[PDB]
Amino acid sequence: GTILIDLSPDDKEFQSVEEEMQSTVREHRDGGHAGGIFNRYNILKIQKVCNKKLWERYTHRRKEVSEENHNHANERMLFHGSPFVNAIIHKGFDERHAYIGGMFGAGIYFAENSSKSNQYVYGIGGGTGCPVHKDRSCYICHRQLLFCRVTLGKSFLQFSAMAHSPPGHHSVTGRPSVNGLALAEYVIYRGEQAYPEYLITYQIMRPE
Ligand SMILES: Nc1ccc(-c2nc3ccccc3c(=O)[nH]2)cc1
Numbered sequence: 001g002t003i004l005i006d007l008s009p010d011d012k013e014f015q016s017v018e019e020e021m022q023s024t025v026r027e028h029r030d031g032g033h034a035g036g037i038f039n040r041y042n043i044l045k046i047q048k049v050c051n052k053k054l055w056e057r058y059t060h061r062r063k064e065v066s067e068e069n070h071n072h073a074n075e076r077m078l079f080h081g082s083p084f085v086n087a088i089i090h091k092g093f094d095e096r097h098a099y100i101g102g103m104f105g106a107g108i109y110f111a112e113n114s115s116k117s118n119q120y121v122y123g124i125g126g127g128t129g130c131p132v133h134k135d136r137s138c139y140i141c142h143r144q145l146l147f148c149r150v151t152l153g154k155s156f157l158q159f160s161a162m163a164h165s166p167p168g169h170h171s172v173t174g175r176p177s178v179n180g181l182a183l184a185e186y187v188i189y190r191g192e193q194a195y196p197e198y199l200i201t202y203q204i205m206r207p208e
């Protein structure tokens with residue numbers, strides 16, 4: 001049921017999604033080990049992910065959460081990187097997409113920093129890198145991230161450097177507590193609380 005609609009680079013929607021991707025790059029404490037060494041991306045394509053059944057699954061859950069949280073879904077647009085991006089856009093997020101060994105438990109993880117999600121494109125810790133060159137810093141191979149609409153509801157705040165949500169909460173927020181430049185990361189425990197709205201194809205760019 002999924003169709004992918006190409007956005008033109010001239011379209012304001014392409015430009016605003018590109019700007020969120022580029023402006024949320026940061027340096028990582030691994031010196032680039034997992035995701036590569038880069039300061040910016042070459043955006044090759046942005047596609048809108050259109051699936052009516054998956055969208056309605058998302059909005060149904062969104063209304064449930066909103067009604068449990070004084071009419072406030074606490075909806076964000078967050079990045080997701082995963083070896084399973086093809087399955088996610090066709091089947092929806094579910095338990096198979098969870099980070100079993102995540103620091104906040106087995107849930108589905110999202111990032112404000114696009115470069116944090118980029119660390120998971122080829123697997124946990126970047127796996128063995130791109131399939132063609134086995135290079136975690138490959139500048140040649142095409143990568144993909146999702147930019148997703150995510151319902152947080154009442155989020156449990158974890159200060160720090162599938163399972164169930166903490167009771168009375170709909171998600172967990174991992175607040176950066178050491179690295180002052182890090183943006184927040186978030187975990188949901190129900191696949192219905194994210195919709196994979198944009199599929200972004202890109203390369204990391206070698207700094208000059
Ligand atoms: N199997 C697996 C494991 C981890 C991820 C994953 N973790 C994250 C952790 C923190 C912030 C963002 C992400 C992410 O964008 N993706 C995806 C699939």
Ligand SMILES: [Zn+2]
Nearest residue numbers: 130133138141
């Ligand atoms: Zn490669």
